[PDB]
Amino acid sequence: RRSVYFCGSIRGGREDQALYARIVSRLRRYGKVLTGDQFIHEQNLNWLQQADVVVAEVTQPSLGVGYELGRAVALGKPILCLFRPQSGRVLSAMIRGAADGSRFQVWDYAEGEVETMLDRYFEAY
Amino acid sequence: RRSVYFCGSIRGGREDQALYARIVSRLRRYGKVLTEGGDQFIHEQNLNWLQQADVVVAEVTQPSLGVGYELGRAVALGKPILCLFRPQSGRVLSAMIRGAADGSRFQVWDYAEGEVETMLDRYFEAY
Ligand SMILES: CN1N=C(N)c2cn([C@@H]3O[C@H](COP(=O)(O)O)[C@@H](O)[C@H]3O)c3ncnc1c23
Ligand SMILES: CN1N=C(N)c2cn([C@@H]3O[C@H](COP(=O)(O)O)[C@@H](O)[C@H]3O)c3ncnc1c23
């Protein structure tokens, strides 16, 4: 059974929290979902090393999500970023520009599509 | 000359623009500041500068994917890091940045809005 690490804004804001729950619920079909500040950081870094794939929802700007992505790229992890363009935001150049189409992927989606997007990525992975 | 890479929110919000310019100015005293095609060019140019950099300085008060990402890449390259956070903002700093501190290779310092130059001074003559 493969490991999935999911990334989503917390102190950047909990606006998309309910959408994170849907993503996590869907990911459970595709693997085990892995996901006092030092302990938080070390436990997360531990789980990040274990993960076979990293999935982030990057619509809500977040330091932690970005940092997780950064450590994940350096660890050679396959990454999927999901961004909602209809949110009115322009995605961070550093995230969007990291997309190489294989190891680092960034997918634009509509709020109601999230499940079908996840299925599409994993049915190809 | 010594190279400094500076990180600050752009697409996460420009609330702290002025404070970055203040930081950049002071950093110029301690070395060359590398940070003054599309997004792919921006990422590639920035990774190149990050690799060259001797030290990484980030203002982490405004939440930002890019800043976090840069800090993540920087840790993995083994760069010395300094994060500055402003508790006056009312925000609670991300656990992942605050928890990433080891007090030498990765420092996270709290500051008040008039202390920014004096905080930067402290780090560089202890560097
Ligand atoms: C209590 N707490 N606080 C966080 N800020 C915090 C951040 N994170 C991780 O970092 C990301 C959120 O970063 P922030 O939005 O900066 O909070 C999430 O993807 C989490 O995996 C956490 N994981 C467990 N507990 C956490 C946190
Ligand atoms: C045009 N543009 N847009 C960005 N979002 C953007 C982000 N960044 C880098 O990423 C950090 C800001 O990321 P975001 O706040 O997510 O935009 C800064 O510290 C910059 O070094 C950039 N560097 C040059 N040009 C940029 C950007």
List keywords for this structure.
hydrolase/inhibitor; Rossmann fold; homodimer; HYDROLASE-INHIBITOR complex; binds ligand TR5; Deoxyribonucleoside 5'-monophosphate N-glycosidase
Write structural notes for this entry.
The structure is a homodimer. The first copy, chain A, has 125 residues and is an alpha/beta fold. Chain A has one domain (1-125): Rossmann fold (3-Layer(aba) Sandwich), CATH 3.40.50.450. The first copy, chain A, is 40% helix and 18% strand. Chain A has helices at residues 17-27, 37-50, 63-74, 93-96, 114-122, and strands at 3-7, 32-33, 53-57, 79-83, 104-108. A 5-stranded parallel β-sheet of chain A has the order 2-1-3-4-5, with helices on both faces. In chain A, helix 3 links the parallel strand 3 and strand 4 (79-83). The radius of gyration of chain A is 13 Å and the shape is globular. The relative contact order of chain A is 0.19. The A-B interface holds A 9-13, 37-42, 44, 58, 61-75, 89-99 and B 9-13, 38-44, 46, 60, 63-77, 91-101. One copy of the ligand CN1N=C(N)c2cn([C@@H]3O[C@H](COP(=O)(O)O)[C@@H](O)[C@H]3O)c3ncnc1c23 sits between chains A (7-12, 35, 40, 44, 62-65, 68) and B (94-96). It is classed as hydrolase/inhibitor. Keywords: Deoxyribonucleoside 5'-monophosphate N-glycosidase, HYDROLASE-INHIBITOR complex. The assembly is dimeric. The entry is titled "Crystal structure of rcl with phospho-triciribine".
